[PDB]
Structure formats: structure tokens, C-alpha cells
Design a binder for this molecule. Structure first.
Ligand SMILES: [Zn+2]
Length: 126
């Protein structure tokens, strides 16, 4: 059965089982797995914050990204997160523009809120 033999996307050789295929449907054999760099895992919260991904970006866009549960955090392949982010945002440039818009909005809002509380303080103490 040809279906049962997976061509490795790294070495090009067929395999039947691997960590990456079992857990993530990533067709990469155990020989080619690079846990420290290419096939490193990241937390859901980290993936979401760093690459600006909504849950539906992970779960509803095709293919849905798979995760392993650690003990209770969901871990995703960074590689897949990054690919999904480029898909959703269109380009690295558009993602970088969004991250900059987000950081500037967040700073502006924190500053405004803090300053209003300082005013409220000075006003109440006065
Ligand atoms: Zn391989």
C-alpha cells in the first residue's frame, strides 16, 4: 500500500512511522528530525503572541495545525506556526507592520491609562 510509505520532505527517503508524522502529520523521518532548531516546539501562547495568530488561524485554516499536550500547555511546531503566519498575513512585511502597529497601540494605551490614574491620584490627594 503506497499510502503507508511516506516520502521524507528532508532526505527524500520513505518511512512508515516517525515522531513528526505521528504527532504533527509532518512527513519528516526520525533521522531528519532537528528538535533544537527546525523542528522545535513552541507554546500556543508564544506562537499566538509572536506571530499574531488567532485560534481559528490554527484550527480552521487548512491544514489544521496539530499540537502535543504537555503537563497543561499545547505545543506546536514553530515551523508550522511561522508558515501559517505568513499565509494569514500574506507577507513577512505585512506581519512586521502589524506587530509594529500593535506595539505602538499598546504603548499609547498603557501611557494614557497610567497618566489618567496619576491625574486621578493628584486630584484626589490635592
Ligand atoms: Zn529523512
Amino acid at each position: 500500500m503506497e499510502f503507508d510509505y511516506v516520502i521524507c520532505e528532508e532526505c527524500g527517503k520513505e518511512f512508515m512511522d516517525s515522531y513528526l508524522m505521528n504527532h504533527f502529520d509532518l512527513p519528516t523521518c526520525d533521522n531528519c528530525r532537528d528538535a533544537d532548531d527546525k523542528h522545535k516546539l513552541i507554546t500556543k501562547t508564544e506562537a499566538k503572541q509572536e506571530y499574531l495568530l488567532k485560534d481559528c488561524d490554527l484550527e480552521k485554516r487548512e491544514p489544521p495545525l496539530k499540537f502535543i499536550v504537555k503537563k497543561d500547555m499545547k505545543l506546536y511546531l514553530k515551523l508550522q506556526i511561522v508558515k501559517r503566519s505568513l499565509e494569514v498575513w500574506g507577507s513577512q512585511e505585512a506581519l512586521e507592520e502589524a506587530k509594529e502597529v500593535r506595539q505602538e497601540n499598546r504603548e499609547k494605551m498603557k501611557q494614557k491609562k497610567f497618566d489618567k490614574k496619576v491625574k486621578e491620584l493628584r486630584r484626589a490627594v490635592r
